[PDB]
PDB file of C-alpha atoms in Angstrom:
ATOM      1  CA  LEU O 674      27.668  18.483 158.377  1.00  0.00           C
ATOM      2  CA  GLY O 675      27.767  18.305 154.637  1.00  0.00           C
ATOM      3  CA  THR O 676      28.252  15.611 152.344  1.00  0.00           C
ATOM      4  CA  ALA O 677      30.822  13.445 150.507  1.00  0.00           C
ATOM      5  CA  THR O 678      31.686  13.777 146.243  1.00  0.00           C
ATOM      6  CA  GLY O 679      29.910  17.323 146.857  1.00  0.00           C
ATOM      7  CA  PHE O 680      31.434  20.827 147.349  1.00  0.00           C
ATOM      8  CA  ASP O 681      29.670  24.051 148.671  1.00  0.00           C
ATOM      9  CA  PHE O 682      30.716  26.917 146.073  1.00  0.00           C
ATOM     10  CA  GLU O 683      30.510  30.918 146.422  1.00  0.00           C
ATOM     11  CA  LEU O 684      30.088  33.909 144.292  1.00  0.00           C
ATOM     12  CA  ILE O 685      31.234  37.229 145.318  1.00  0.00           C
ATOM     13  CA  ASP O 686      30.663  40.448 142.991  1.00  0.00           C
ATOM     14  CA  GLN O 687      34.181  42.253 144.910  1.00  0.00           C
ATOM     15  CA  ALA O 688      33.241  45.318 142.365  1.00  0.00           C
ATOM     16  CA  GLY O 689      30.408  46.352 143.490  1.00  0.00           C
ATOM     17  CA  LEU O 690      28.477  45.398 140.590  1.00  0.00           C
ATOM     18  CA  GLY O 691      24.750  44.833 141.842  1.00  0.00           C
ATOM     19  CA  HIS O 692      22.231  42.235 142.049  1.00  0.00           C
ATOM     20  CA  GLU O 693      21.226  41.792 138.541  1.00  0.00           C
ATOM     21  CA  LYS O 694      24.900  41.736 137.097  1.00  0.00           C
ATOM     22  CA  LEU O 695      25.602  39.011 139.930  1.00  0.00           C
ATOM     23  CA  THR O 696      22.398  36.834 138.568  1.00  0.00           C
ATOM     24  CA  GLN O 697      24.009  37.302 135.062  1.00  0.00           C
ATOM     25  CA  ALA O 698      27.432  35.895 136.386  1.00  0.00           C
ATOM     26  CA  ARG O 699      25.189  33.141 137.985  1.00  0.00           C
ATOM     27  CA  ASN O 700      23.292  32.075 135.074  1.00  0.00           C
ATOM     28  CA  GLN O 701      26.621  31.999 132.766  1.00  0.00           C
ATOM     29  CA  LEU O 702      28.392  30.020 135.501  1.00  0.00           C
ATOM     30  CA  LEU O 703      25.415  27.434 135.635  1.00  0.00           C
ATOM     31  CA  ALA O 704      24.590  27.242 131.804  1.00  0.00           C
ATOM     32  CA  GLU O 705      28.599  26.452 131.455  1.00  0.00           C
ATOM     33  CA  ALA O 706      28.913  23.747 134.200  1.00  0.00           C
ATOM     34  CA  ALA O 707      25.872  22.002 132.351  1.00  0.00           C
ATOM     35  CA  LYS O 708      28.088  21.207 129.362  1.00  0.00           C
ATOM     36  CA  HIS O 709      30.326  19.185 131.680  1.00  0.00           C
ATOM     37  CA  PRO O 710      28.041  16.327 132.143  1.00  0.00           C
ATOM     38  CA  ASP O 711      30.950  13.715 132.945  1.00  0.00           C
ATOM     39  CA  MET O 712      32.522  16.200 135.720  1.00  0.00           C
ATOM     40  CA  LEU O 713      29.894  17.910 137.445  1.00  0.00           C
ATOM     41  CA  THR O 714      26.599  16.644 138.450  1.00  0.00           C
ATOM     42  CA  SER O 715      23.649  18.042 140.173  1.00  0.00           C
ATOM     43  CA  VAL O 716      24.885  21.843 139.899  1.00  0.00           C
ATOM     44  CA  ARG O 717      22.378  24.239 140.986  1.00  0.00           C
ATOM     45  CA  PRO O 718      21.673  27.950 143.110  1.00  0.00           C
ATOM     46  CA  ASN O 719      21.011  27.128 146.631  1.00  0.00           C
ATOM     47  CA  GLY O 720      18.970  30.528 146.900  1.00  0.00           C
ATOM     48  CA  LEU O 721      15.746  31.760 145.674  1.00  0.00           C
TER      49      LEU O 721
ATOM     50  CA  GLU Q 722      49.159  74.535 174.348  1.00  0.00           C
ATOM     51  CA  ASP Q 723      46.002  76.427 174.979  1.00  0.00           C
ATOM     52  CA  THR Q 724      44.891  78.301 172.158  1.00  0.00           C
ATOM     53  CA  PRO Q 725      42.159  81.367 171.446  1.00  0.00           C
ATOM     54  CA  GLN Q 726      38.836  80.145 171.095  1.00  0.00           C
ATOM     55  CA  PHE Q 727      35.598  81.947 169.994  1.00  0.00           C
ATOM     56  CA  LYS Q 728      32.834  81.993 172.752  1.00  0.00           C
ATOM     57  CA  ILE Q 729      29.520  82.757 171.201  1.00  0.00           C
ATOM     58  CA  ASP Q 730      27.087  83.808 173.976  1.00  0.00           C
ATOM     59  CA  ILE Q 731      23.159  82.885 173.429  1.00  0.00           C
ATOM     60  CA  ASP Q 732      20.573  84.934 174.848  1.00  0.00           C
ATOM     61  CA  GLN Q 733      17.832  83.007 175.838  1.00  0.00           C
ATOM     62  CA  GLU Q 734      15.600  85.906 177.159  1.00  0.00           C
ATOM     63  CA  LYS Q 735      16.316  87.789 173.817  1.00  0.00           C
ATOM     64  CA  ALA Q 736      15.577  84.888 171.623  1.00  0.00           C
ATOM     65  CA  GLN Q 737      12.204  84.130 173.515  1.00  0.00           C
ATOM     66  CA  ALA Q 738      11.287  87.408 172.864  1.00  0.00           C
ATOM     67  CA  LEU Q 739      12.105  87.098 169.334  1.00  0.00           C
ATOM     68  CA  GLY Q 740      10.186  83.310 168.616  1.00  0.00           C
ATOM     69  CA  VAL Q 741      12.857  81.533 168.192  1.00  0.00           C
ATOM     70  CA  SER Q 742      13.637  78.151 170.379  1.00  0.00           C
ATOM     71  CA  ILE Q 743      17.156  76.988 170.961  1.00  0.00           C
ATOM     72  CA  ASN Q 744      16.545  73.820 169.383  1.00  0.00           C
ATOM     73  CA  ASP Q 745      17.184  75.606 166.342  1.00  0.00           C
ATOM     74  CA  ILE Q 746      19.537  78.153 167.230  1.00  0.00           C
ATOM     75  CA  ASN Q 747      21.950  75.245 168.346  1.00  0.00           C
ATOM     76  CA  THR Q 748      21.192  73.225 165.410  1.00  0.00           C
ATOM     77  CA  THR Q 749      21.932  75.918 162.883  1.00  0.00           C
ATOM     78  CA  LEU Q 750      24.979  77.037 164.692  1.00  0.00           C
ATOM     79  CA  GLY Q 751      25.803  73.224 165.385  1.00  0.00           C
ATOM     80  CA  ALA Q 752      25.083  71.760 161.706  1.00  0.00           C
ATOM     81  CA  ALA Q 753      26.631  74.560 160.157  1.00  0.00           C
ATOM     82  CA  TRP Q 754      29.830  75.085 161.752  1.00  0.00           C
ATOM     83  CA  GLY Q 755      30.583  71.770 162.965  1.00  0.00           C
ATOM     84  CA  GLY Q 756      28.345  69.356 160.344  1.00  0.00           C
ATOM     85  CA  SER Q 757      25.378  66.803 161.295  1.00  0.00           C
ATOM     86  CA  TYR Q 758      25.329  63.018 160.620  1.00  0.00           C
ATOM     87  CA  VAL Q 759      21.415  63.137 159.628  1.00  0.00           C
ATOM     88  CA  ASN Q 760      21.031  59.177 158.459  1.00  0.00           C
ATOM     89  CA  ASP Q 761      22.594  56.800 155.694  1.00  0.00           C
ATOM     90  CA  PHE Q 762      22.197  56.065 152.202  1.00  0.00           C
ATOM     91  CA  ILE Q 763      23.333  53.512 149.419  1.00  0.00           C
ATOM     92  CA  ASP Q 764      26.400  53.937 147.467  1.00  0.00           C
ATOM     93  CA  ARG Q 765      27.401  50.904 145.003  1.00  0.00           C
ATOM     94  CA  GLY Q 766      25.605  48.655 147.348  1.00  0.00           C
ATOM     95  CA  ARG Q 767      27.218  49.970 150.489  1.00  0.00           C
ATOM     96  CA  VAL Q 768      25.844  51.991 153.371  1.00  0.00           C
ATOM     97  CA  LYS Q 769      27.479  55.201 153.986  1.00  0.00           C
TER      98      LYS Q 769
END
């Protein structure tokens, strides 16, 4: 199973953008989820 | 209903005398007139 008080999120490129266009969308989302410390903690990517 | 169709009649004695094989007579006939699937490529990240 997973965990309680914890989510599991996907980030799909549904327009054929690429891998370097998806990493820049991935880093934009994480750097924006780090400025909400009172709502979101321990946000990270799962891959490499 | 049964249509006219164009029978082409390869001679393999007369081809052997000229130096061609039927491993590229039938390919030149088949890939030009019918079309040949060679391999795959990548088109915006999709195998086509």
